[PDB]
Amino acid sequence: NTQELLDLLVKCENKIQTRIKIGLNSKMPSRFPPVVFYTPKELGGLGMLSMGHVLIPQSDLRWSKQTDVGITHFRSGMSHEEDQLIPNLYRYIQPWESEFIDSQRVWAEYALKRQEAIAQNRRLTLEDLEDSWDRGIPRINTLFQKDRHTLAYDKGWRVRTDFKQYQVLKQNPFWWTHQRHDGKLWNLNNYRTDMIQALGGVEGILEHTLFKGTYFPTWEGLFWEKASGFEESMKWKKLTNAQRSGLNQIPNRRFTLWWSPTINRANVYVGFQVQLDLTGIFMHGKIPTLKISLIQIFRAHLWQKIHESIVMDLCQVFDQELDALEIETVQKETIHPRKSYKMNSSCADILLFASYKWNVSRPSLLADSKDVMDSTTTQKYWIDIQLRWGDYDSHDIERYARAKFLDYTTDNMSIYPSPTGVLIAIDLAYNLHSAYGNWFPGSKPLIQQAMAKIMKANPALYVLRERIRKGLQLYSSEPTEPYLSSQNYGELFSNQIIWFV
């Protein structure tokens, strides 16, 4: 009813949102996406319950899926209606007059049921009464609680709870009624589901949370470490004031790294672009938490290491199957050390010279099937690997692959010994492999399978994934121990060492 109350609550809600934003970075986001502020803490977000009405943009409601067959794309909020908006608090709060009427009706029904069951030579059913569950201003949901006999002794706890302000040094917002005494009057269970599905579903929310940066499909069963070992060390060591602040500033860094894609966009935080010291991650606006987290994850020339790993894996794969590919020489140029994270691939990664001739078709993407090898005939071939870090809006690998191939191949600065070849691209944040350009006859499925196999179990990529899992405190979903022993009993001699007590 009170318009002033709504205005003030929205104003202070925006105040706290701006406080969080300035905590993230000194400047102010141009767009300030609302996925971060409303994703529940179970999914790794602030999960701010709000009484306002903010319509989530459809541009941020899309998500992708890098399936083996192809890169599928979906949009949860594609319905032809009003734009998806996070539901407000009052949408799931019972009216007070409705609360009183329901309390009266349910208590009358409970009294009638008790009177009927008195003659049943037994206690109340407590099962058919479930039709009146979670109702009534008194704790009718707790009317069957075990502590009721213990609770019946207390009389007039309301005054004690009120005077707790003079007793307890901390403010008690729930002084209207005591928890586990008048019961949980407000049912807030559907709110979480409504908020998560209205934000774009679980997958839609996770699409901007670096979840695709972990190869394990830990959609369910994953463990998120709220407190790490450093927290225990700080608690035990009796840290100083600055050390206490540093220990308390850990979860902020944690989820800000966990929210890197949607927080490092281009439309959000407009200004001068900047990349790290020796990597290929572009950040808009100085974010000390994200900067320090990124330089921890990419410590010790990790970008150059993963580039060398992928180029060596490609070279080994090509050498192994050099028979059908008519490969005479498969080598790599004297690549400058800084040319791994460079914006433009001025130096070619892998060169492959065949024996006499090599038919190459027109450039295309790996999803294509048609091929006309008579387009060109060259004796050389080039393969380039593009190490890129996809954002929440620039994660389109196929479009990025096309644009990058067109720019690099058609450029004066870039020097390619062969005019015919294919450029490969790996989105580290998306962990998505793609390629674009010409192909060797019959090598396109071979290159696709090789890329999939390498990206499955690349050493440096696995190390980077483990680093991400540790830094974000997302522990891998725990495996299930073979509690069964019928097979173990037969294979008891097979076990090297076993004992029972």
């Binding site: 709504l6 949102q17 300030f32 009405h53 407000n88 559907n190």
Partner: peptide, 28 residues
């Protein structure tokens, strides 16, 4: 739209309080 949370006064007449408020069910 994502810049700030809009005031409720504009969309006040959209629906009622507790429009999709459902009661809970017993456990076990």
């Amino acid at each position: 739209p994502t810049g700030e949370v809009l005031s409720l006064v504009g969309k006040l007449e959209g629906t009622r309080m507790g429009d999709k408020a459902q009661r809970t069910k017993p456990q076990m």
